[PDB]
Design an enzyme around this catalytic site. Structure first.
Site, PDB file in Angstrom:
ATOM      1  CG  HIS C  49      -0.277   0.239   2.515  1.00 21.17           C
ATOM      2  ND1 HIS C  49       0.269  -0.786   3.257  1.00 21.17           N
ATOM      3  CD2 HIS C  49      -0.071   1.371   3.229  1.00 21.17           C
ATOM      4  CE1 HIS C  49       0.782  -0.294   4.371  1.00 21.17           C
ATOM      5  NE2 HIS C  49       0.590   1.012   4.378  1.00 21.17           N
ATOM      6  CG  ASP C  80       0.196  -4.068   2.776  1.00 20.13           C
ATOM      7  OD1 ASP C  80       0.615  -3.567   1.711  1.00 20.13           O
ATOM      8  OD2 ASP C  80      -0.177  -3.379   3.745  1.00 20.13           O
ATOM      9  N   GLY C 152       4.378   7.052   8.878  1.00 22.72           N
ATOM     10  CA  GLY C 152       5.765   7.459   8.731  1.00 22.72           C
ATOM     11  C   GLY C 152       6.705   6.280   8.584  1.00 22.72           C
ATOM     12  CG  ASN C 153       6.799   3.444  11.812  1.00 23.43           C
ATOM     13  OD1 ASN C 153       5.667   3.155  11.421  1.00 23.43           O
ATOM     14  ND2 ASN C 153       7.123   3.468  13.100  1.00 23.43           N
ATOM     15  CB  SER C 154       3.574   2.176   7.075  1.00 19.84           C
ATOM     16  OG  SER C 154       2.998   1.096   6.364  1.00 19.84           O
ATOM     17  CG  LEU C 200     -13.432 -22.885  -5.810  1.00 21.69           C
ATOM     18  CD1 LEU C 200     -13.261 -24.153  -6.622  1.00 21.69           C
ATOM     19  CD2 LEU C 200     -13.744 -23.220  -4.355  1.00 21.69           C
ATOM     20  N   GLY C 201     -13.104 -19.633  -7.642  1.00 28.44           N
ATOM     21  CA  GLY C 201     -14.090 -18.858  -8.372  1.00 28.44           C
ATOM     22  C   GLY C 201     -15.443 -18.736  -7.701  1.00 28.44           C
ATOM     23  CB  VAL C 202     -16.991 -19.789  -4.859  1.00 28.07           C
ATOM     24  CG1 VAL C 202     -17.317 -20.911  -5.828  1.00 28.07           C
ATOM     25  CG2 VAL C 202     -15.798 -20.174  -3.999  1.00 28.07           C
ATOM     26  CG  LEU C 204     -16.474 -18.375  -0.349  1.00 27.79           C
ATOM     27  CD1 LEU C 204     -15.088 -18.775   0.123  1.00 27.79           C
ATOM     28  CD2 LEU C 204     -17.351 -19.602  -0.571  1.00 27.79           C
TER      29      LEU C 204
END
Lengths: 376, 376, 376
Positions: C49, C80, C152-154, C200-202, C204
């Site tokens: 991010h 992330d 700042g530190n992320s 898979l394509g679902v 949930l």
């Protein structure tokens, strides 16, 4: 030394004794807070407000995976403390430290068990030590700390660098109830189920511009059938002294009367204006049930959030509950049930036992759109 | 070692030197902030904003119970520092450390005396050291720290693990003014009562899309009867150099001019556009009173909260005060008093001495509902 | 020992390896966050991010003054994490510690380089260690800490008292991604440019009051041309087991399927109701561009801030930009460009290459005041 790099070995045994308290990462909240195991018998200390809005109290112990039902041994709302009990043996217990031998700058750690899936520990120092002027707890050090205190660890442990309990975390830069006061309170609560306090029966306010021309506590209300009422204390009386010692304000009067026992004899100096009068009298002397509706008594704090209302306040109504489609909302006030006039939670419960499951008529007030009848 | 378990012995002597500053647990606020004792003579350092809105400054010393009246020795609004004086001897004093010999990761503690009923200490490290590019304080380390800095301890001490002052806490993850700068500032303030700074007389803005085609400071206003005005500097002049050194922005121009003395001779390079011109000139060169009404001068910061308004701004009016029923509110502007046109706090005070207690007519503006006349 | 007074010598080498990441004290933000140098070759790890809304990534190294252009080696949005590359040699690198050998109460420090003008370090302990129940990262300790974690530190470093990396700071009392997981993720990202995961394509949801009478994941949608679609999985199917092991909820199903590879064969137990059925199938399987307009794909998170919308969302429009006077605002949705129907950011970019600089017609929707045509 171990503490150049870690405090884990110093706090690991204390962590074992900090439990989670719940009702009913992730979904497991429904979480009320933390508690501390104090006896191998199964006694646990926490804040009053953690278990306040809960029947069916559940306790999660570190390394258990099994929730244990707890029964309420006792509560003390003034000190925000409570003792509950679970049935288990050979539990890990916390070791108390002397809370009057701690200093500003001592290392402390706040331990909580916020969701029953592990501990959370924050590090800091004793930031300030606060002694009230008066009462039975005059010289107890209430602890401020920059170790983070929060609803996750409220009711949990505040320990020194050697793992000894110096306080019970209280959330509402961080406050902790000193461990000596906690020890005495839990000892009185395991016995007696309560903290017995004297009661005078007066509402109080301080002086601003009255020249009474003194200091003290102004009586703004005299409760009926109370020692103050039967002794002849009137509204606008300035209570200046208790047993020959001055009270500066309503705080000191509150704590000196509350430090006395029921049925104890006490003498008071009062200024009608400005003729000193003396009174001698005998002193006299509220948890609610939950369900999905909760109620609580209208304390002076509660009606702040309204005098002279009588009955319970429905604090919260969870969404889509069987009692929300009945018509109950937040902020309503149940004033009547069938033939029982509801003036407190006790009246509420007594009405509920009579005719439960039978048809039942509530007269409930809304501050807006008001009086409506609910047939439960 | 002591620090495996506590820092109390290392900070206890420093705690003795951190005082509370007030006006007029619980009621005792009315609290302005903290201060630090720096000389046994009775000199105390604090932030400017702590004592900004206060006459009648009161100081509470640890272990005293007695408030001492303080007189304002000096202020420096740019550095947010101030020195006050109390009359007492054999006071505990803080010991300064070298603020250019501190490192990121050093242990530090922030000490305040928020209400005059005891100290509050928070623990952390030096998080960052920030040197401005320019000026007399070019190489002073402004201190960030994760020790909590807050209005309680603003003006208080930031000390190292040996109890030496490394900074003065400043609240507005935590900032502290370095102790070397503090020492120099308080030395100039005990003398001279102030910090003498040069003044040019220009309002300034930076460049965005002007092609001036350089860097520097755009002159947006030239104050009348100022060195810049008398030298022939016009609006839209781009000041690019001072004494042959480039200024990148209005920050550098501000700090280089402010690092110069009054009556000092300075030369400036300017771009009309784009012909370089040279100017050589002599440099030139606001606390308010309180009462219950306070006022303050319309600084460029103040009219932000509006140019070209002249007069004082009534910052706050406390409730039920003898000046609230007169008609004074918050955000009004006193523009006229009898025959004195109020353009600053000095005009306000001069008007107040003339005819005090006598009937007195204020013309005061409200941004809404506006000009009204108050007969005090 | 050094740590009685300071941690600087223990963390100084680690500080050298924490860089700033930017785009395009003071003005220099335009700051995205921090990163950590992990190889002398020039590889840097950060959060996804941090670099999400940015082309033209710029890196500032401690003691450099020179910004280096970085190219995006790889991203992993689920973890992330992201790896970027700069061209430079003999860089200072971080040293990894074992994140499964850390304990609650260990001293840790969070290092960031918030604006490229120096480091910022915060001190605390390991507050909690959190292991998810399931998946390839089942036993990775996600780190909570009371060392301050902030934008700042992320993306910066979380180090132990010996300067070894125990985690990558993540901001959104503080969370860090464990260093073992980070090492494995960056190794897979330097190769392969991505993290390959099964699909898979679902869609949930969990169970609330359905008696299905089991636990598991309710299928609320079946994506067309997906393995689930071609296998015969229908809406309202309750997926209860994967390869003979129960999944309690959609979290476990998500992490078990995501821990599998593309083209990998998997079997599933499903309850139509309540007849168990078995499926066996092959598993299958979004960063945006910036400019001044940015866009992003409509993830399920994005349309929350709306299903069935197709196209990009113009996340932000900076003021007075050449694309703001065109008519683009925040929260609009570009649905058509000339002949290309925009259904994702890829369609957006493909439309942009065709006919760039040429006249170009956008059909763009506004949730209020809606469909408008912009000729760029």
């Amino acid at each position: 030394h171990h503490h150049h790099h870690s405090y884990h070995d110093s706090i690991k045994d204390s962590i074992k004794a900090v439990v989670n308290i719940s009702t009913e990462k992730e979904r497991m909240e429904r979480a009320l807070g933390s508690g501390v195991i104090i006896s191998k018998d199964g006694y646990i200390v926490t804040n009053n407000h953690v278990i306040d809005g809960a029947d069916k109290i559940k306790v999660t112990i570190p390394g258990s995976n099994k929730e244990y039902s707890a029964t309420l041994v006792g509560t003390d709302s003034e000190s925000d403390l409570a003792v509950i009990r679970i049935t288990k043996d050979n539990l890990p217990t916390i070791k108390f430290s002397d809370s009057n031998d701690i200093s500003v700058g001592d290392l402390v750690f706040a331990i909580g068990n916020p969701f029953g899936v592990g501990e959370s520990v924050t590090q800091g120092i004793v930031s300030a030590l606060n002694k009230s002027g008066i009462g039975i707890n005059s010289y107890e050090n209430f602890i401020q700390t920059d170790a983070s205190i929060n609803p996750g660890n409220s009711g949990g442990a505040l320990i020194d660098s050697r793992g000894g309990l110096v306080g019970i975390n209280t959330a509402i830069i961080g406050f902790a109830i000193p461990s000596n006061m906690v020890k005495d309170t839990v000892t009185q609560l395991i016995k007696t189920g309560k903290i017995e306090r004297g009661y005078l029966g007066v509402g109080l306010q301080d002086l601003s511009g009255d020249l009474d021309n003194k200091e003290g506590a102004v009586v703004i209300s005299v409760e009926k059938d109370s020692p103050a009422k039967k002794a002849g204390i009137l509204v606008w009386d300035l209570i200046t002294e208790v047993n020959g010692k001055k009270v500066k304000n309503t705080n000191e009067l509150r704590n000196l009367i509350g430090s006395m026992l029921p049925n104890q004899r006490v003498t008071l100096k009062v200024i009608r204006d400005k003729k000193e009068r003396a009174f001698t009298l005998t002193l006299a002397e509220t948890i609610s049930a939950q369900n999905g509706l909760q109620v609580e008594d209208l304390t002076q704090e509660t009606k702040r959030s309204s005098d002279d209302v009588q009955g319970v306040l429905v604090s919260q109504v969870n969404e889509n509950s069987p009692a929300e489609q009945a018509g109950f909302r937040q902020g309503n006030i149940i004033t009547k049930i069938e033939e029982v006039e509801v003036k407190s939670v006790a009246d509420f419960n007594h009405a509920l036992e009579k005719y439960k499951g039978k048809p039942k008529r509530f007269l409930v007030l809304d501050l807006n759109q008001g009086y409506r009848i609910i047939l439960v």
